[model samples]
Target: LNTLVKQLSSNFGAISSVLNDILSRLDKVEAEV
Candidate 1:
């Protein structure tokens, strides 16, 4: 069970990073509108 988290952490972190990128772009687009 402990080892399972190692994989989850890696995947979760990667997904969070992309969401952050998308969010940043969205903010910029909103400013233009």
Candidate 2:
């Protein structure tokens, strides 16, 4: 059960990281505008 939770957390972390990158880029574009 612990291993399963760890794997899920890692997957979520990867997805969240990608989303953060996208959001950061959007913020930069907004700043330029």
Candidate 3:
């Protein structure tokens, strides 16, 4: 169960990182206009 939890946490970390990247890019585009 501990191993599974660790794996899930890492997966979530990766997903959050991708989401943050997308958000930053969107902010830039918004600033342009």
Candidate 4:
């Protein structure tokens, strides 16, 4: 159970990181336009 929880947390963190990166790029584009 602990291992499963750890894996879920890690995956969530990775997904969050990717979303943040995508949003950052969109923000830059918005600023230019």
Candidate 5:
């Protein structure tokens, strides 16, 4: 059970990182416009 929880946490961390990158890019575009 502990191993499973660790895997889920890693996956969430990766997804969150990608989302953060996309959001940052969007913010830059908004500023330019």
Candidate 6:
């Protein structure tokens, strides 16, 4: 169960990292506008 939870957390972290990257890009675009 602990291993399963670790895997899930890693997967979530990857997605959240990507989401932050996208948001950062969007913020840059907004700043340009």
How high is each candidate's TM-score?
Answer: 0.78, 0.67, 0.81, 0.82, 0.80, 0.75
Compose the digit string of candidate 4's lDDT tens values, residues 1-33.
Answer: 999999999999999999999999999999999
RMSD each, Å: 1.0, 1.3, 0.9, 0.9, 0.9, 1.0
Candidate 5 Cα RMSD (Å): 0.9
lDDT of 1 by residue, 1-33 (tens): 879999999999999999999999999999999
Alpha carbon lDDT at 5, candidate 6: 100
CA shift at 16, candidate 2, in angstroms? 1.1
lDDT for predicted candidate 3 compared with the true structure: 1.00
Query: Measured by TM-score, how close is model 6 to the native structure?
Result: 0.75
Sort by TM-score, top down from the best: 4, 3, 5, 1, 6, 2
Model 3 TM-score (2 dp):
0.81
Off by over 4 Å in 3: none
User: For candidate 6, lDDT tens digit of each residue in 2-25?
Assistant: 999999999999999999999999
RMSD of 2: 1.3
Please write out the lDDT profile of model 2 over residues 1-33, one tens digit for every residue: 999999999999999999999999999999999
Model 5: colliding residue pairs: none
Top TM-score model: 4
Please list the C-alpha lDDT of all candidates, in the order they appear: 0.98, 1.00, 1.00, 1.00, 1.00, 1.00
Off by over 4 Å in 2: 31-33
Model 1, global lDDT: 0.98
